[PDB]
Design a protein around this ligand. Structure first.
Ligand SMILES: OC[C@H]1O[C@H](O[C@@H]2[C@H](O)[C@@H](O)O[C@H](CO)[C@H]2O)[C@@H](O)[C@@H](O)[C@@H]1O
Ligand SMILES: OC[C@H]1O[C@H](O[C@@H]2[C@H](O)[C@@H](O)O[C@H](CO)[C@H]2O)[C@@H](O)[C@@H](O)[C@@H]1O
Ligand SMILES: OC[C@H]1O[C@H](O[C@@H]2[C@H](O)[C@@H](O)O[C@H](CO)[C@H]2O)[C@@H](O)[C@@H](O)[C@@H]1O
Ligand SMILES: [Ca+2]
Ligand SMILES: [Ca+2]
Ligand SMILES: [Ca+2]
Ligand SMILES: [Ca+2]
Ligand SMILES: [Ca+2]
Ligand SMILES: [Ca+2]
Ligand SMILES: [Ca+2]
Ligand SMILES: [Ca+2]
Ligand SMILES: [Ca+2]
Ligand SMILES: [Ca+2]
Ligand SMILES: [Cl-]
Ligand SMILES: [Cl-]
Ligand SMILES: [Cl-]
Lengths: 149, 149, 149
C-alpha cells in the first residue's frame, strides 16, 4: 500500500507537470508567441511605471524591452498606444539602464530625447511611431510584459 | 526515506499549485483583466439565459453584472453584440435582482424600457451604446461571464 | 501519521486536476470555443506544412480541418490570411485524405482546383473567400490548429 501509493502519486505529479507545461505552450501560442521568439502581452491597462513592474513581476515576466528594431516594432504592435519600456535612468540621471540590468544597447530615441524635461523624466515610453521619449515614471502608460523566447 | 519522499512531494505540489495560479493570472491579464477589476470574457456564443448561467457556473464564474458605468462599458466592449446580464425580475415583476443576490443598484435602461413586452420579459441584455433592454429569458444572446477581481 | 499525509496528498492532487481542467475550459472558452464545437487557434506564424503539423501535434491538436461550411468560415475568421488545412494527397496523388485519417468529403475548392500545379502540390490552403487551393507543402502559410469539441 504505502509505497505503491507514494510511487503512483509521484507519477500523478509528473503527469500534472507535463499537462501544465502543455497548457502554458497552448496559451503562449494563442497569445501570439512565435517559434523561438520572445513574446509580448498587454491587458491594455495604463498605469504608472512602478505598477507595471510590480504587475509583470507577479506574472514572472519583465517590463518589455526591445533589443533591436524588430522587437521594437513587436512591442509597438502589441501596445497600440504609448507604453512603458523596461528602461530608466533612475539610478544615475542621464544614464539609461535596463530594469534587468546593464547599459542600453539598442535605442530609438525621438530627436532631442531623452531630455529629462521639466520636473524630470526617468522612464521611457515607446510612442505611436516606435520612437522613444523619456517621461515621468509617475505618468500612466500601457503595461506590456515580456516573456522569454 | 518514505517520510522524506512524502515531504519532497508535498513541496512539488505546492510549487505546482503556485505555477497553475500564475497560469490563471497570465491568462486573465492576456484577455484584458485590469488590476483590481473583475475579469469579463466571452466565447461569442448566443444562447438562452439558462445556458449562459450553466456555462459560466461550469467555469466557476457567473453571468456578467455591471455594478457601475465603468463595468458596464467593460462588458460592452467584450460582448460587441447584445448580451445577457446576471439580472432578472422573475420573483417580483419590476424588481430586478442580481442572480448572485441583492437588489439592482446601477441601471442603464434604454428609453421606454423595461417594458416586460409581449408575453413577458424577465431577463436583461446590454445592447447598443451599452444601454439595457429587458428581454425574454428564452431568447438567445451572447454569453459573457465574469470572474472576481 | 504517514497515511493521513498520503490521503491529503491524494486530495491535493485531485483538487489540482480539477483546477487545471477548469483552467483549460476557461481558456478554450476565451479562445472562442462554442458549446459542443471544436475550436481553432493560431499564433499567426507562417511556416511549412511539416512544421504546422508538428506544432499542433505537440499541443495535442491537429492542423485545422473544415468539415462543413460553418467550420470553414470559423477557420477563415481565425486565420485572417492563407493557412494550411489538415488535408493532403501526399499518400496517393489525386486522393486527398485528412491527416487524421479518411478520404476528403466536404470540400470548398476554388474553380479549377485542385490542380497539382507544376512539379506538384500535395497540401491545401484556405485562402480568399475561404476557398481552397492545393499548394506545395514546402510553402509557408499560417499555422492554425484545431482542438476537439
Ligand atoms: O512632457 C512630455 C513630453 O512633452 C514633449 O513632447 C510631446 C509629448 O510627447 C506629447 O504630448 O506629444 C507631442 C507630439 O504630439 C510631443 O511633442 C517634449 O517636451 C518631451 O520631451 C516630453 O517628454
Ligand atoms: O421584443 C423584443 C424587443 O423588441 C423591441 O426592441 C428591438 C429589439 O431589441 C431588436 O430587434 O432590435 C431593435 C433595434 O434594432 C429593437 O427596437 C422592443 O419592443 C423591446 O422592448 C423588446 O424587448
Ligand atoms: O503555384 C501557386 C498557385 O498559383 C496559381 O494561383 C495563384 C495563387 O493561388 C495565389 O498566389 O493567388 C493568386 C490570385 O490572387 C493565384 O493566381 C494557380 O496556378 C494555383 O493553382 C497554384 O497553386
Ligand atoms: Ca532623475
Ligand atoms: Ca532622467
Ligand atoms: Ca522627454
Ligand atoms: Ca415577470
Ligand atoms: Ca419583467
Ligand atoms: Ca423590452
Ligand atoms: Ca503528389
Ligand atoms: Ca497542369
Ligand atoms: Ca497533389
Ligand atoms: Ca493549386
Ligand atoms: Cl520620473
Ligand atoms: Cl422572460
Ligand atoms: Cl507538395
Amino acid at each position: 500500500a504505502i509505497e505503491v501509493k507514494l510511487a503512483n502519486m509521484e507519477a500523478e505529479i509528473n503527469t500534472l507537470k507535463s499537462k501544465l507545461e502543455l497548457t502554458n505552450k497552448l496559451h503562449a501560442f494563442s497569445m501570439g508567441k512565435k517559434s523561438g521568439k520572445k513574446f509580448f502581452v498587454t491587458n491594455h491597462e495604463r498605469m504608472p511605471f512602478s505598477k507595471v513592474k510590480a504587475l509583470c513581476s507577479e506574472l514572472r515576466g519583465t517590463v518589455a524591452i526591445p533589443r533591436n528594431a524588430e522587437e521594437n516594432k513587436a512591442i509597438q504592435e502589441v501596445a497600440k498606444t504609448s507604453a512603458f519600456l523596461g528602461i530608466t535612468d533612475e539610478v544615475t540621471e542621464g544614464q539609461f539602464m535596463y530594469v534587468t540590468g546593464g547599459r542600453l544597447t539598442y535605442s530609438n530615441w525621438k530627436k532631442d530625447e531623452p531630455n529629462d524635461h521639466g520636473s524630470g523624466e526617468d522612464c521611457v515610453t515607446i510612442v505611436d511611431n516606435g520612437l522613444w521619449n523619456d517621461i515621468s515614471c509617475q505618468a500612466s502608460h500601457t503595461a506590456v510584459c515580456e516573456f522569454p523566447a
